[PDB]
Design a binder for this molecule. Sequence first.
Ligand code: PC1
Ligand code: 3PE
Ligand code: 3PE
Ligand code: 3PE
Ligand code: DCQ
Lengths: 70, 167, 105, 347, 97, 313, 96, 114, 98, 80
Amino acid sequence: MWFEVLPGIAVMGVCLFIPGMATARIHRFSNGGREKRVAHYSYQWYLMERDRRVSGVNRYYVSKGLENID
Amino acid sequence: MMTYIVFILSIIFVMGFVGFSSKPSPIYGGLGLIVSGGVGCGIVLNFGGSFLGLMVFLIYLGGMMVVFGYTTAMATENKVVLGTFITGLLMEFLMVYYVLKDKEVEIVFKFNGMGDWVIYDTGDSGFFSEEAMGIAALYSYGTWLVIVTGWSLLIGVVVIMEITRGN
Amino acid sequence: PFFDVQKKLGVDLDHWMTIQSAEQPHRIPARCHAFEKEWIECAHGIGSIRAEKECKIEFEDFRECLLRQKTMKRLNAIKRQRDKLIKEGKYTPPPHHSGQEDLRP
Amino acid sequence: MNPIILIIILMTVMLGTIIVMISTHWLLIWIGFEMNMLAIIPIMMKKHNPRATEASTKYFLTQSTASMLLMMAIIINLMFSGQWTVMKLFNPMASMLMTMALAMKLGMAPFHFWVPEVTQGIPLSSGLILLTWQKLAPMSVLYQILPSINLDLILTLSILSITIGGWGGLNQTQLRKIMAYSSIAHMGWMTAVLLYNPTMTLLNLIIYIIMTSTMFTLFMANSTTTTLSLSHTWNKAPIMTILVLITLLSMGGLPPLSGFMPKWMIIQEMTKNDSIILPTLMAITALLNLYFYMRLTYSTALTMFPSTNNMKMKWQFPTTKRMTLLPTMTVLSTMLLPLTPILSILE
Amino acid sequence: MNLMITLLTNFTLATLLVTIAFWLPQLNVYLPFSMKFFLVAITFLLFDLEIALLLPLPWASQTTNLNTMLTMALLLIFLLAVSLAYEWTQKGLEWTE
Amino acid sequence: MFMINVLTLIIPILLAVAFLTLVERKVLGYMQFRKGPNVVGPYGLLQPIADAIKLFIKEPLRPATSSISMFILAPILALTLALTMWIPLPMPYPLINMNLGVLFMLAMSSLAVYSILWSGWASNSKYALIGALRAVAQTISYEVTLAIILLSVLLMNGSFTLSTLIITQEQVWLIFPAWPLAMMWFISTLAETNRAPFDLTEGESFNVEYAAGPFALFFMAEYANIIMMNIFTTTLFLGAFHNPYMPELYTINFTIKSLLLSITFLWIRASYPRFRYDQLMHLLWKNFLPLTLALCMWHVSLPILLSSIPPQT
Amino acid sequence: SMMRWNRERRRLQIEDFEARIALMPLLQAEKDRRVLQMLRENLEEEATIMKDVPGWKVGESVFHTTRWVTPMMGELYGLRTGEEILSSTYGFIWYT
Amino acid sequence: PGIVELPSLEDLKVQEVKVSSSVLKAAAHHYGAQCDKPNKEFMLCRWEEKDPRRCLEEGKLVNQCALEFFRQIKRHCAEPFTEYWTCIDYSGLQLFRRCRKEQAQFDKCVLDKL
Amino acid sequence: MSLVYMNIMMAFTVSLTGLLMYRSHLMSSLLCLEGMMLSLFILATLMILNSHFTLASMMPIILLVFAACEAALGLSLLVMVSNTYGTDYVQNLNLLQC
Amino acid sequence: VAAFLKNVWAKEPVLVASFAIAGLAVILPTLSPYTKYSLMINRATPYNYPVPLRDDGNMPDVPSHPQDPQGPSLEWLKRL
Ligand SMILES: CCCCCCCCCCCCCCCCCC(=O)OC[C@H](COP(=O)([O-])OCC[N+](C)(C)C)OC(=O)CCCCCCCCCCCCCCCCC
Ligand SMILES: CCCCCCCCCCCCCCCCCC(=O)OC[C@H](COP(=O)(O)OCCN)OC(=O)CCCCCCCCCCCCCCCCC
Ligand SMILES: CCCCCCCCCCCCCCCCCC(=O)OC[C@H](COP(=O)(O)OCCN)OC(=O)CCCCCCCCCCCCCCCCC
Ligand SMILES: CCCCCCCCCCCCCCCCCC(=O)OC[C@H](COP(=O)(O)OCCN)OC(=O)CCCCCCCCCCCCCCCCC
Ligand SMILES: CCCCCCCCCCC1=C(C)C(=O)C(OC)=C(OC)C1=O
């Protein structure tokens, strides 16, 4: 009956679920277990490049806390 | 090579202009001006003009060249073109060769041959795009400009309806 | 006939976009704000004929801010002599001009 | 055309020129020219025939080309000065491009080739607007940029306009082409005195506008676009032949008339600057203009050409045309020379 | 940079699929001018320019000159409406209304 | 690693377009008191694969085209623009997080009329060119209300950023303050994709010279556009809850809403007759455009009068 | 609902902007020492390169004024590698 | 023209604040409260002199007063601050509004112990 | 000056010589005219973005809008020319020689 | 004025809704008490750095610290 349309709808829904889940997991894999930094404005980019310079490993996402000061 | 990306896009821009200005057919001329508008948008985007580049896409290519190709499709349906095209191409690549081997050229103005990244600013704008704020100031500071532009567009509507009527 | 209606009526139709040193949104400076301010305050009121000869220093500084021709010519000279000394082998770049020093902040 | 739409469009022509005259920013100059061209295109296509569409297309192409050259001159000025003030230009290339663009908008030679075609293609009232009101905005821009105008360029344009406008009107029998070549020669006279004294530029502009408006108003009042239809005027309205006689003798610059006033003052300003050959050759070249003006006075007022029989019907009907300001313009175009020192009001 | 890679990838995939679709089945042997359409295209162009004037409004609402900004925003949308009303009443929107 | 992210965007686009054809045939079956394809695959699931294999080996139509170059470029442009409309879509995170993603989508959708125009001119048939000019005039007409509705909505957003539009709708769906904009938006996106009741390319009152392959390419670009405009309408008016530590909640929620909205397109094509061409021109220029201008004035003036101007950043 | 939530978002924006403001003096001091570091390194390498060149004044200003001029991008990153150049001049524009 | 006068590499040496931007944003409001005076001295000097070379020593005082700010957090409230800037650091826009309970614990521990 | 300005000016001069050397079609002339406008847009935009001259950021938009309105007018003239002769050939527009 | 409105509402309700929504867009911001708060919130948003003043000796309204009592306050925005 009407539930016969549901397998194709389910396959199409899995195919629409893949890109967002994929980019979320790829952002967390590529950005140290966290969200990708949003730099829409040049201040956010300045802070991100400052984090890349203070990390010492040329990666913005490697965060340095109070252990890096004396 | 990647430090010269605005220069490379500007070369493709001049090549597209030599493409449509040699005038093969107004439909291929429309295509050449479309490709030129896209790469000129890319130049504008690489100087940080995101909104102005998207205005080239939305208004120039998506608005005006659509109407050009539309009118051309309603109106329409060589050796001079090819020679003119290779002439403009050889002039442009002689310009490229001179300004790359010399890092300086003078056609009418003096031009540096370094990568055009050198002229940029070394700071930040904080929490705004300066270009977005200057375009937003059309409503706060550009009152007279809004008045004369909107009046010219209303008059443009009236003028097109006058001259296309034939009565 | 420049009928100066804007000064006559006290209205600002287009003086605001005329110069870079004018009042900008969010007090955003132009890159040549100081040079343009110096050239405008030099050349103010003395007329264009006296401003050509008496404000030439500020105007040359301001044109060189706007187009950076002398700066790019100097960088051309330094980079060309550096490439010549690299080709001759009479110079080596330091580690901080090769990318091996882990910048300041 | 709807009369309300005609009024709004004519006010928009006027508004574009006024924006050019009052603005301090180069973008608003360019906007005033764009607004003026956009609004004046329907005035040229007022009667909807292929000659008006051809004239409007030629006018569009020349004025659009001049507008793009103007914007490139503005943009080069912004490169070399970082600003937009309507004053002297800060590059000789931008000065050359803006002088070329304004010469194209004026139709000065060797960019003169649209003016007889576009003037012939359009009605007499719209050609009146084209030859008088449309000179006002580019002359005001030339007025403000004269510290940067190259002398050799503007004088080359001036003498080339005077010679080409003199020889061009000699071959013409159409009245609109006669007024167009007369326009080209008078704009050459206006730009020749510009770098020396722009008050005499304004004087020549005003006297030219008065005399040209007088001649177009006479042509509209008699419904004449050819020499040979203007030659019927004596058998229909003999006062109009006297008026075209005195106005054409004035446009030739014959004293004691008012059109002797500009060129004399122009020579008076060009010899103070030790230029003697140039106003001499300019004045001798203006005898060409006087020759075809005299041709029109011979055909219209000083002889009686043969008429037709149907003219007897038009004897029974008076001119219902609004001949707006025609007696005032006829008096000002002829009897103004005793008031020549009034020119100081233009300073 | 990631955007240029993404545009190149979409263009490469589209060109590859078009090249497949034009050369995979090769293995087997086997108008009068209408003034009305031009007028609707020009009306699109003019209203599209008016839209280009309207596009910085989400940024323009952030100003401290809000009385002037609101006046000019309502004036631009009003002139777009007056353009539509003139297009309506002079029979410009007819037979493609 | 970024190329993996590009592929996991664009290959599931093609798979979802492939199975949208099955969903359409099944839903239009069961709304027409019959069954759809249920013979080829189990529950009909292999029908798009069989139809794709059938179209790839069908004989070329062999046109004597006016231009070969634009005949090739119209499917390339259509597919490229159909794939680039997906890259700023926040679901919850976009592939390309750009600050002006809304305006990017509006520009790249305004470019898609050249595929129609170039395919209509590249065909020899004058009537194919007439249908192409009608389709282009339809599309550029409804782009006007797309632009103005989208501007009026983003007056509540504060920016052109698509990811901010999730923040905008954390307390309420944006269909609650903007349901007239939402319904004119939805009908305008229906008329953008040449979708019924606006499909005059299928009515007897432009790409007929293409072979079965390039017709399938135009068709899959069109269904990519349909799924994309439903996703964009979902993000725009029916914004879901987003937990930043569990992004899949947002992905499941927007995916369900986007599927229901695509099925609503399918419901609409199975429910109404077509418009005549002057009638949808009347619908745009005389119905949607005056209301859209009035609501644009209202959504300019309303955040100022309520003190509800959104943030810029 | 949009009234309450946009007013809350404006308060949150003011809190973000004041965090930025409280951080700006440290960032400005670091930026000043950063650009003076880079100009001093460029000056020392100009001194050790431009010795054969006759009539060359090392560190000669191109401006007649002795006022501080904000350093251009090629003035700071001219002698450095292309990766640092490309980062500092197109990194924010090319970022995502 | 004249020779530009640059300060030496020894005059630019200072003990840097080597913490990330999420650490700075988490400590930002208390840093603007506690380190007000040398920061405003530096920014007054920076807007009046219009020259970074004339503002170095004041700038060093900024870099001297920030470190004393963080040590006084590291001596007393290192763990609530660490738990707070980690939650700030997770977010892509680094939202304050996602982290209100860690902020409340940090503000509680700072208001109590300092 | 900077190297991209050479190419944008050369693009303007190429489209200028295209617009000053007609072949047959009026449409090709209008395309060269709008290419001139596009190059003016790009050159203005690169100057204004380089200078950080904020208020002139609205200038190229205005330059776009007016000129596209100008382009609209040009297309209308072309159409009326094409409603007379069947083509948009510039050699049909020669009635005003006499 | 009453039969005309019912006539145009019966014939053309789209245009009646258009002119009504546009009229409410025009006249209602002049009648709203919250239009002032829009301006206050826009001028209370700190895009730039608050460049401090040199204490000449007599500025009683300018604070020496952010947590001082004098200066502009945002209690109206926290409360509303
Ligand atoms: C985004 C999520 C989904 C959103 C909703 C979409 C789902 C529903 C879809 C239904 C099927 C649609 C299939 C296609 C149909 C196309 C035809 C169609 O709809 O035509 C539209 C029709 C067209 O009208 P028409 O052509 O049918 O009627 C005849 C029209 N004349 C008179 C001109 C001949 O209506 C509209 O254009 C209205 C658009 C929406 C208006 C919303 C108004 C809101 C209320 C304003 C205030 C009113 C009170 C007065 C003032 C008060 C002030 C305080
Ligand atoms: C520093 C200087 C600043 C500027 C100073 C002022 C400059 C003024 C420039 C004058 C230009 C005037 C152009 C003509 C008016 C504009 C509108 C127009 O053309 O109206 C004429 C009108 C049209 O009639 P229509 O129906 O179209 O004709 C077809 C046949 N039925 O009706 C007619 O055709 C009726 C016939 C008579 C019309 C005569 C109009 C004369 C106007 C000019 C007067 C002289 C110039 C002003 C004084 C000197 C100023 C320099
Ligand atoms: C017939 C020819 C072939 C036709 C088929 C293929 C072409 C058509 C389909 C592709 C269209 C390409 C469009 C390219 C530009 C799109 C606009 C754009 O880049 O916008 C996104 C973004 C703006 O947002 P924003 O966040 O401000 O930027 C980052 C700052 N933090 O900006 C950025 O992120 C900027 C990133 C760097 C700059 C990117 C420049 C791209 C290259 C130039 C265009 C290339 C294509 C030219 C021709 C296209 C067809 C006209
Ligand atoms: C002041 C506020 C701002 C106003 C400007 C902004 C408006 C925003 C909406 C944009 C509208 C743009 C286009 C308007 C076109 C108007 C002309 C028109 O449509 O006339 C024709 C129409 C009869 O229709 P017809 O020609 O037959 O078309 C086929 C369908 N039958 O004729 C009619 O149906 C008559 C239409 C006019 C009367 C409508 C009255 C509505 C009153 C609502 C309440 C009062 C609202 C306050 C404002 C005052 C309005 C008068
Ligand atoms: C290689 C990836 C897939 C390429 C595209 C082919 C499959 C999708 C389109 C095929 C199609 C299907 C299934 C289909 O159902 C259909 O009828 C509605 C079509 O014709 C209009 C089709 O073209």
